[PDB]
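Schema walkthrough. Field components (list of strings):
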Amino acid sequence: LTLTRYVELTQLLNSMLTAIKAISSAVRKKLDVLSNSLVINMLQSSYSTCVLVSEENKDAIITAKEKRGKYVVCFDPLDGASIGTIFAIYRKPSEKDALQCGRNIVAAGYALYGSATLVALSTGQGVDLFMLDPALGEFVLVEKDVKIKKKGKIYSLNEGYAKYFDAATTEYVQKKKFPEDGSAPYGARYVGSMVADVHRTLVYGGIFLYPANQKSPKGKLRLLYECNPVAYIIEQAGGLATTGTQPVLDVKPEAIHQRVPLILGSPEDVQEYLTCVQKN
Amino acid sequence: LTLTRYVELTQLLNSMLTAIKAISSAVRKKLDVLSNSLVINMLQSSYSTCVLVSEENKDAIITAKEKRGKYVVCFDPLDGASIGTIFAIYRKPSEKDALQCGRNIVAAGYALYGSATLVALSTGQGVDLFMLDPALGEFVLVEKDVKIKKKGKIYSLNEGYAKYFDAATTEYVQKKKFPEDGSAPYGARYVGSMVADVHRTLVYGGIFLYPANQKSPKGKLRLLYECNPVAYIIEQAGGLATTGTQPVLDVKPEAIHQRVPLILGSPEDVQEYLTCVQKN
Amino acid sequence: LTLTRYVELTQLLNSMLTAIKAISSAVRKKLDVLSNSLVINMLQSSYSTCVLVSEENKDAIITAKEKRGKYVVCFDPLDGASIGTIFAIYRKTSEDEPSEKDALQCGRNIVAAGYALYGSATLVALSTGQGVDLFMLDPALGEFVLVEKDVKIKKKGKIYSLNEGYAKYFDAATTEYVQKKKFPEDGSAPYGARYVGSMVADVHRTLVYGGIFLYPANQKSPKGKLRLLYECNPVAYIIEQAGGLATTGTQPVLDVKPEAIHQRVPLILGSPEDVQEYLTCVQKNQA
Amino acid sequence: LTLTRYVELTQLLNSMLTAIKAISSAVRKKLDVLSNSLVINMLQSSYSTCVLVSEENKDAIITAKEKRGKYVVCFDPLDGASIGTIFAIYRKTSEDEPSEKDALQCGRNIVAAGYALYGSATLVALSTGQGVDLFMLDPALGEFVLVEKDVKIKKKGKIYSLNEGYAKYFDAATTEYVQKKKFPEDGSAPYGARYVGSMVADVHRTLVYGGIFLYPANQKSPKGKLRLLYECNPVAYIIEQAGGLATTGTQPVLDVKPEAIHQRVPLILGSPEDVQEYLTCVQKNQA
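Field assembly_structure (string):
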C-alpha cells in the first residue's frame, strides 16, 4: 500500500521522501532557500551520502567526517502554480563523482506539488506512482510500473522561441499542427515548469521539448539534476529522452551545472523528432 | 488579515468559501460529482440562493420552499495538475434569472487548487487575492486590489488548433513570435486548465485566448459560469475580456450552457488582438 | 451546520474562534506566551474590544483608541494531554474611561462565554444566553461543526471530581460530602472518582456526563484557588446556561462582585442535585 | 530525528505506526470497530504476524498462512478528551500450530511494546528492550519525531492515581496506603490526587511526572479490572523499561503467566519508591 513499506540506500530514500513531505507542507504554506536545507540535511543525516549536488548550491557538497556513505545525490530541491522536486542517486573521494552518466543511476524520481502531491520513483524495475495521503502522512501506491503511451497526441514546447529554432524543430512542429496524412493535429500544452510538463507526458503520452535554439546554444535544462533524472524515469517507462544527438542518459557530464537540450516522451513521437533532426 | 472578517449575501459568500475549503481538502485526497453536491448544498443552505446553474447539472436549480433568497449563483464546481472553482453571483421566479449579462454580477471569483490554494474574489471594488492557511483553515489576504500589467510578454493559447484558426488569430500569433519592431517575441504558456491560465494572466500579465475556430464555431468556453466570472475579475483588475466582437460582460446570455470565444489579459495586448480581428 | 454561519459581538466572536483554531494547531505542533499573543492580537484587531484581562498579564490591556470597541474580554488563553482556552465577554457599561474597573463586573453581566478543549479532538462550548451549543473542529474544513444544540446537564450525576490529596486541608462540609460520595447512607452505589486537574477538562466532563466538580476553599487556600474573572465566571455561565449550578459555597459564582482582576473564588459546580447536596453540607456545618 | 529512520520486527512496527497515524487522524475527525479494523489489517499485511489478540475480538485472529510471519501481537486499538492505543509484541516460540496458546506468554517475553496517546498532541511511547523512547507526531510532516531518548521514571513521585470512588470496596492495604498519601505520618505534604480514568493517560502522566497508579483488586473486582494481555503487560513493560515497577500486589506483572486471552490482573505501577510503599501495605496486611 504505502511507500515506507516498499522502501541501506533504502534509508537514504525515506530520508529524501521526508524532505519532500516537508517541502510539500511548506509549499501549501525565502523558499528555494529553505527547501535546500531540508533536502541537504535529511540526506546528510540518514547516514548514506558522500557527495550532494544541488541546483541552488553552485559548488558540490561533500558530506564529511562522522558520516560519509556509498551514494551520490543530485537534486533540484524546488523547481519553478506547479512546483516540483527532482533527484537522481548514484553509487561510486570528491566532486568528480556526480559526473557519472545517467546510465549509472541507482535510483531517481520527482515530486510534483500540484492539486495533490505526486511522487514518481524508480530503482530500475519500472516507474511507480505514489500520492501523498495527507491524513496519514504517508505516500500510497497509486500505480505500479507505469508505461508511457506508444504515441501521443500532445506536443509540448515554448513556441515563443519559434523565431530562434533550428529547422528540424520547425518542421516537426509544423507536422504536428499540419499533419499531411489526413489525421488530426496534435494538441499543445506547456506549463513551463519542468516537472509538470514531464509528468503530464508520462501519464498522457506525447512529446516534450526544450531544444537548443540560438539563445541557448547548449540548451537550458541542467543535465545532472534535471535532465538525467526525468530521462531515467521516462526510459524506465519505456519512453525516450534524447539531447537530439545522443540519448540523454549517455552524455558523459562535464560540469555539475552543465546544460543540455531535452526531448522526451512517447517513443514513436521522439523517433519522429529524431528523423526531422537527422534530415538536417 | 483573513477572509471571514472582511466578508446578507455575505453569508452566501462564506458558504461558497466553505465549499471551496472542502473541495480543496478532497482534491489533496467520482470527484466532479462530489464537488457539485458540496457547492450546491452549502449555497442552498446559508439561506441566500434562489437559482443555481452548474456545469455538471444541465438543468437550472431552483432552491425551493423553506428557503429562497435574493441571489443567483452560476458556477463550475471543478474545472479540469491544476484544477479550480469558478462562480458568479447575480441579483434579480425561475431559470431565466441567470441570463443577466455579466454587467449584472454582484460578486464573482475563482479558487485555484495548485501548489497552494488561492482565491481571487471581487464584489466590485477591485480584485483581492487570498491564500488558504491550512494550519488555520482560514483564507488570508495576500494581495489587495490587484491590477493587471498594462502589457504582457506572454501569450496563451492552444496552437494545436493553428490549422483551424481565423486569419486574425494567425496574424496576431505571428506578431507575437515574430515581432517586426525589433523587440523580443512573447513567451508562450498554456496549461490547458482555464483557471490556471486565467490566474497566471492576472498575476503576470499577457493575453489568453480560446477563440473560435472551425471546429468550435461559437468557441468552447461556457459563458455563464466560466467566461462571465473571469471576465469580471480581469475587467475589475483593469484588463479586458472580449469574445472578439463584444466585451464578454456585455453578451446577453441566451442559454445556460451557451458557449462564447474568450480573449482576455493585459489591456494593450487585447487591443492589439482586436485590431487584428477588425482588419478581417 | 457550521459555526461561522450561525451568527459587533459577532466579529469579536470570530476573532476568538480564529485564535482558537490557531492555538489548536500550535498545541498539536513558551507556548503560553504565544497563545496569549494570538488571543490579544486577534481580539484587538476585531475592532470590538476596549479592555482585555488575561491570565498571563498582571495588568489589564487597554485597546488603543484607534481600534477601540464596546466589549471587555477576560480569558485564560491556554489553561493547563488535555488543556483549554476559556473566555468571558462583558459589555462596557460605564462610559467614563475604559479602565480595568470595566473588567470588574459580576458575572450576571456576561454577554457571551465559552471554552475550547484541545483533546482527542478540539471542542468548543459556547453560550450567548440562549443555552449552550457545542462545536467540533473539522480539520478537513478548517471550521467548527455544530454537534449538540442546547446541551442540558443531567439533573444528577454519578461522578465527583476534586483533588482528594487536599483531604487534610478540607473544611467539614467538603469532608462530609466526599464521604457520602464514597460511602452513601441511602443504599446507593458510591459515586465514581474523576479528576484530570485541567479545569477545562474536568468541567467539560461534568457538562457532558453530569455530576459535580469542586476546587473549594481549604486551609492552604482560604479564598479558593481558581480565578474568578476568566476561569470561574465563564464556566459558571456555561453550566448555569446548561441547567446546572455554580456556587462559591455561599453564593452563586455569577453573583460575586469582583474586587481585583486576578481575584480568587471557591468553585463547586455541576448537576443541580449534586451541588444542592454539597450546599447542604455547607449550611449544616456553618451552623 | 525521525521515528521511521531509527530502526522483520522493523516492518511489523511500521505497520503499527501507520495504523496509529491513521487512528489519530480519525479520532481528531463505532470508531472502536474502525480502529480495530485499521490495526488488524495493517498488522496482517506487514507479513509479520501469525496470531493477533485484540480487546475487541473474543477469539484470537490467526493470520492466513499466506501472510504468516513470526510475531504475536496483543493490542487495545483504542482504549477509552484523552484516549490511546496499546500494544505488546511477542515472538512465536513453539512451532506447533499457530494457536492462541501463542498469545499466552508471560510478559517477560515481550519483544517490543508501546502505546500511543491521542491528546493535545499525539505521543508514542515505545520500548524494544533498551529503554523507553518518546515520539511526537508532527502533522506537518506525517511522521513521528523523537523528543526524549531513554526516559527514566522518577525514583519517587508526589501524585497517587486511582478511583477513590471504590474506597468502600478496598482491601486493607489499599485503604492504608491511600490514607498515608492524604495524611503522611512523616511530616511531609500530602501527595496530590490525579485520575483521568483513561489508563493510557494515567500511566503516561505517571511516566512523565512520576508517582503511582493503581487499579487494584477490590470486592466487586477480586481479580482486578484491567486486562493482562494487551493493557497491563505492555505498560508494565514500558514502566519497568523506564526504571519503575509494576506489580499485581503479589508479583511482578510481567511474571504472571496468562491462562486466557482476556484474563484480568490488579495493576499497581509507577515510581519505585511509591510501588514499594504500596507493597509494604500489602505484605503487612496479608500477615
